[PDB]
Amino acid sequence: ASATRVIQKLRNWASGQDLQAKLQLRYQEIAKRTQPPPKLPVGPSHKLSNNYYCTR
Protein backbone atom coordinates (compact mmCIF):
# COMPACT_ATOMS: atom_id res chain seq x y z
CA ALA A 1 0.00 0.00 0.00
CA SER A 2 2.96 2.24 0.78
CA ALA A 3 4.65 2.34 -2.62
CA THR A 4 5.13 6.10 -3.33
CA ARG A 5 3.16 6.05 -6.65
CA VAL A 6 6.32 5.90 -8.83
CA ILE A 7 7.82 2.64 -7.62
CA GLN A 8 4.19 1.56 -7.97
CA LYS A 9 4.37 2.41 -11.68
CA LEU A 10 7.80 0.77 -11.93
CA ARG A 11 6.57 -2.53 -10.51
CA ASN A 12 3.33 -2.55 -12.49
CA TRP A 13 5.37 -1.99 -15.65
CA ALA A 14 8.12 -4.52 -14.95
CA SER A 15 5.66 -7.23 -13.96
CA GLY A 16 3.26 -6.05 -16.67
CA GLN A 17 -0.04 -6.01 -14.79
CA ASP A 18 -1.64 -4.00 -12.01
CA LEU A 19 -0.96 -5.52 -8.60
CA GLN A 20 -1.78 -2.52 -6.40
CA ALA A 21 -5.39 -3.64 -6.85
CA LYS A 22 -4.56 -7.32 -6.17
CA LEU A 23 -1.95 -7.35 -3.41
CA GLN A 24 -0.38 -10.25 -1.54
CA LEU A 25 -0.60 -8.51 1.84
CA ARG A 26 -3.79 -8.13 3.83
CA TYR A 27 -4.40 -4.73 5.43
CA GLN A 28 -8.10 -4.10 6.15
CA GLU A 29 -10.03 -6.18 3.57
CA ILE A 30 -10.41 -9.27 5.78
CA ALA A 31 -12.64 -10.46 8.59
CA LYS A 32 -12.05 -8.76 11.93
CA ARG A 33 -10.72 -11.34 14.36
CA THR A 34 -13.45 -10.82 16.97
CA GLN A 35 -16.93 -11.59 15.66
CA PRO A 36 -20.49 -11.67 17.00
CA PRO A 37 -21.93 -14.89 18.41
CA PRO A 38 -23.67 -17.32 16.04
CA LYS A 39 -26.79 -19.41 16.46
CA LEU A 40 -26.33 -22.58 14.46
CA PRO A 41 -29.42 -24.25 12.98
CA VAL A 42 -30.64 -27.70 14.00
CA GLY A 43 -31.12 -30.34 11.36
CA PRO A 44 -33.84 -32.90 10.80
CA SER A 45 -34.62 -35.71 13.25
CA HIS A 46 -35.32 -33.04 15.91
CA LYS A 47 -38.90 -33.26 14.63
CA LEU A 48 -40.23 -33.97 18.18
CA SER A 49 -42.77 -36.41 16.66
CA ASN A 50 -42.98 -39.00 13.89
CA ASN A 51 -39.21 -39.50 14.29
CA TYR A 52 -38.52 -43.14 15.17
CA TYR A 53 -34.96 -44.38 14.71
CA CYS A 54 -36.36 -47.63 13.30
CA THR A 55 -37.55 -45.71 10.22
CA ARG A 56 -34.20 -44.02 9.46
Q: How far is the CB of 46 from other proteins (least distance, A)?
A: 10
Residue 55's binding partner among other proteins, ligand CDL, none (Cβ under 5 to 8 angstroms by kind) is: none
By CB under 6 A, residue 55 contacts ligand CDL:
no
By CB under 6 A, residue 4 contacts ligand CDL:
yes
Residue type, 51: N
Residues that bind ligand CDL (CB under 6 A): 2-4, 6-7
